[PDB]
RNA sequence: UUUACUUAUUCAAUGAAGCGGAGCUGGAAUUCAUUUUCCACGUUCUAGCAUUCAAGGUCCCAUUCGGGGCUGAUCCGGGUU
């Protein structure tokens, strides 16, 4: 206040120094970022096939929150605990001489593409969850259509990683559960009908579902200037 | 097999809001068949017709109105003021030998991003107990009357486009204004607009095209 | 050049080691004149848009 | 037969640009933010002539609007422009001689120079010594400015298309004979070796297509198809007319 | 048999800086009852000066010897043109 006196500075066109502006939109971009972003963007440019159009189309957050809320206690034996599996049938089958059946059969979450694929053909699985991931689209396209023609459940979720993280892997893509618990049997039933009206029957309408055909905010707002300011004012 | 008359649809032409009886005539255009129609493709058409039959007057039977195609709503397309041409027997009748004729050029624009050009041709007459069947001008007469007509029209056409332009040309305010002004010395009769035509419109936008409807 | 003193090489004046000072005289008079003509042609705008 | 001059010059070596001493090229200030919006307070450095041309160039330096910086850009010659002329550049900068902005952002009949089919090209057509261009049509629907070139072209460009008012400083350059082919030798000193030229009726059959004959003549009609072979190309390429020139070329 | 939008294909251009839309203010047709809408958005006497998160406006500092954003300069959305 005592000696705080200011003066004005113009910035308005053809004069004055233009300071720290948010270049975020128009910045120099390399070949790697160039294709990965315009990749999912060229995927919204043309119409998504009848087979796809389901990729981006998925389950709701809250329902999937429980499909992981109990799946965490279903973490397989890591290097240290898998080595602890070998020390339980070594201090039992020798010190008490057991007949193989000493440690109870596994009751955790299932992992494995080729195998969880064979689980739906023999429908030996109690539940099946599918992921809308994988770089090669045409590589895992048969997961949803087989579950449909065999009657096995499939809920496309956002997280093929958590499938394998709480399973000792990195990726898995198929989180099945042909078993259950002497208390978590309620989770099996509840989810079988919840995921039923989630995608199983939804496919009856999603039978000939097409997507895509969308442009950027640029060809969208000026698209609402020619074709929109044509009749509607 | 040709038979193109069964492919020509009939369109009805309407009139502006500054004129009477909107129903003019029934003409033909082109109905969509072997692929091709008549909508948002060309629209490079106008209208040539006297406002005398489009109003109801005989003693005042002159001044041809020029129009332009706007938008079509279910076989009922309107038109807007985009010109006003004349006939040759109108100019060749007013202009005789032994008298003086004048040419006055002027440019006037509006506030809707519209542009048009107007003209004005002036003539002379006699006085009480006239003997001589002749007499010319003196140059210091034609200069003054020219800059007077341009003044009144360039400040009475700006704003609300051709809506106000026609609100003074049909009721003849310009004809009685210049006639009584220079009447203090040398009057001069007739002096109309003659040929006047527009040529630059804004673009589209249904918002500005609705402010002038009836 | 780089092996002399300031008070020997160039001078202890404004733009003494850049232009010539003669073409620099027609500068201060041209620059300071349109800085006062700029405040004179600045406050006139502060009233041309105040009456309305 | 052997190979001919023009066909040999196609490969390149010495048929390059005789620059080095030259000040620069012909590229103004590419259209940007303030260039498509408002304008700028331009300042001309000088009118130094290019080392190898006919009409001089206006090295217009621009006051960088991104920090205290002054980069000298380049324009062509403008009939009567002094040193220190405030040549402003902007779509919102008024129509003045030497100043530049969009053709659709200005009137018809206006004669500009260094015209370009694209705004920010820094230089395209209407750039030769002493010539001009005239805007004969303005259609504000889809930015279209119909302008005319020196021979009579109707190239309708953009309304935001770059064009500076004025003619190229250097009129009457060819309206005066050189007499001495020595100053013709002095001009090519900083251009190229596209001179001196000779008659194919003088060279041998192998040397050039007109070649041979101890009586001197072409052999086959000088008239050649507008698209002849890269060996039979030397003469009258598409002369629908030939004798009393009317400047007609593609269709006039 | 016809024209549309763009993402493939393709041009030109920069050290991807000004994009689509809309909006803060004002002006410009005036309202069928109120926002029914179109244009600009610090720089035009003159071979000048323009640059350090700009200064200000405002709050936390645990007060200091010094510092930080927001707006200023609209904001929303990532499609450099």
Curated annotation (Swiss-Prot), chain A:
Matching entries from InterPro entries are given as: eL8/uL1-like, Ribosomal_eL30-like_sf, Ribosomal_eL8-like_CS, Ribosomal_eL8/eL30/eS12/Gad45, Ribosomal_eL8/Nhp2, Ribosomal_eL8_euk
Could you cite one Gene Ontology molecular function of this protein?
Answer: structural constituent of ribosome
This chain's protein is named Large ribosomal subunit protein eL8A
Gene Ontology BP terms: cytoplasmic translation; maturation of LSU-rRNA
| Single GO cellular component term | cytosolic large ribosomal subunit
PROSITE patterns under this entry? RIBOSOMAL_L7AE (PS01082)
Keyword annotations from UniProtKB, A to Z: Cytoplasm, Ribonucleoprotein, Ribosomal protein
> What does the annotation say about its assembly with partners?
Component of the large ribosomal subunit (LSU). Mature yeast ribosomes consist of a small (40S) and a large (60S) subunit. The 40S small subunit contains 1 molecule of ribosomal RNA (18S rRNA) and 33 different proteins (encoded by 57 genes). The large 60S subunit contains 3 rRNA molecules (25S, 5.8S and 5S rRNA) and 46 different proteins (encoded by 81 genes).
Domain of life the protein comes from: Eukaryota
Q: Name one Pfam family in it.
A: Ribosomal_L7Ae
Job description of the protein: Component of the ribosome, a large ribonucleoprotein complex responsible for the synthesis of proteins in the cell. The small ribosomal subunit (SSU) binds messenger RNAs (mRNAs) and translates the encoded message by selecting cognate aminoacyl-transfer RNA (tRNA) molecules. The large subunit (LSU) contains the ribosomal catalytic site termed the peptidyl transferase center (PTC), which catalyzes the formation of peptide bonds, thereby polymerizing the amino acids delivered by tRNAs into a polypeptide chain.
Swiss-Prot record, chain B:
| Signal peptide stretch | none
* Keywords from the named record: Acetylation, Cytoplasm, Isopeptide bond, Phosphoprotein, Ribonucleoprotein, Ribosomal protein, Ubl conjugation
> What's one GO BP annotation on this UniProt entry?
translation
Organism's domain of life? Eukaryota
An example of a Gene Ontology cellular component annotation for this protein is: cytosolic small ribosomal subunit
Single annotated GO MF: structural constituent of ribosome
Disulfide bond positions = none
Where, per UniProt, does this protein localize? Cytoplasm
Similarity comment: family membership: Belongs to the eukaryotic ribosomal protein eS1 family.
Q: How does it assemble?
A: Component of the small ribosomal subunit. Mature ribosomes consist of a small (40S) and a large (60S) subunit. The 40S subunit contains about 33 different proteins and 1 molecule of RNA (18S). The 60S subunit contains about 49 different proteins and 3 molecules of RNA (25S, 5.8S and 5S).
Name of the protein described by the UniProt record: Small ribosomal subunit protein eS1A
UniProtKB/Swiss-Prot annotation, chain C:
Where in or outside the cell it occurs: the entry states: Cytoplasm
Q: What else is known?
A: Present with 23600 molecules/cell in log phase SD medium.
Subunit comment for this entry? Component of the large ribosomal subunit (LSU). Mature yeast ribosomes consist of a small (40S) and a large (60S) subunit. The 40S small subunit contains 1 molecule of ribosomal RNA (18S rRNA) and 33 different proteins (encoded by 57 genes). The large 60S subunit contains 3 rRNA molecules (25S, 5.8S and 5S rRNA) and 46 different proteins (encoded by 81 genes).
| Annotated family | Belongs to the eukaryotic ribosomal protein eL34 family.
Described by its record, this protein's role is as follows: Component of the ribosome, a large ribonucleoprotein complex responsible for the synthesis of proteins in the cell. The small ribosomal subunit (SSU) binds messenger RNAs (mRNAs) and translates the encoded message by selecting cognate aminoacyl-transfer RNA (tRNA) molecules. The large subunit (LSU) contains the ribosomal catalytic site termed the peptidyl transferase center (PTC), which catalyzes the formation of peptide bonds, thereby polymerizing the amino acids delivered by tRNAs into a polypeptide chain.
The entry's protein name is Large ribosomal subunit protein eL34A
Q: Organism source for this protein?
A: Saccharomyces cerevisiae (strain ATCC 204508 / S288c)
Starting at the broadest rank, the lineage of the source organism is:
Eukaryota, Fungi, Dikarya, Ascomycota, Saccharomycotina
> What is the gene name?
RPL34A
Query: Parent protein range shown?
Result: 62 to 113 of 121
Swiss-Prot record, chain D:
Positions bearing Phosphoserine = 51, 94, 158-159, 248
UniProt keyword annotations, A-Z: Cytoplasm, Isopeptide bond, Phosphoprotein, Ribonucleoprotein, Ribosomal protein, RNA-binding, rRNA-binding, Ubl conjugation
Q: Which domain of life is it from?
A: Eukaryota
- List GO BP terms, alphabetically: cytoplasmic translation; maintenance of translational fidelity; ribosomal large subunit biogenesis
The compartments listed are: Cytoplasm
Q: Where would I find the Glycyl lysine isopeptide (Lys-Gly) (interchain with G-Cter in ubiquitin) crosslink on this chain?
A: 45, 92, 118, 144
| Pfam families in UniProt | Ribosomal_L2, Ribosomal_L2_C
Q: Which GO terms describe its molecular function?
A: RNA binding; rRNA binding; structural constituent of ribosome
Main localisation:
cytoplasm
Query: Quick check: keyword rRNA-binding in the entry?
Result: yes
Q: Which GO terms describe its cellular component?
A: cytosol; cytosolic large ribosomal subunit
Family, according to the entry, reads as follows: Belongs to the universal ribosomal protein uL2 family.
Assembly information from the UniProt record: Component of the large ribosomal subunit (LSU). Mature yeast ribosomes consist of a small (40S) and a large (60S) subunit. The 40S small subunit contains 1 molecule of ribosomal RNA (18S rRNA) and 33 different proteins (encoded by 57 genes). The large 60S subunit contains 3 rRNA molecules (25S, 5.8S and 5S rRNA) and 46 different proteins (encoded by 81 genes).
Misc remark for this entry?
A: There are 2 genes for uL2 in yeast.
Q: Which PANTHER family match?
A: LARGE RIBOSOMAL SUBUNIT PROTEIN UL2, RIBOSOMAL PROTEIN L2
Protein known as: Large ribosomal subunit protein uL2A
**Origin organism of this chain?**
Saccharomyces cerevisiae (strain ATCC 204508 / S288c)
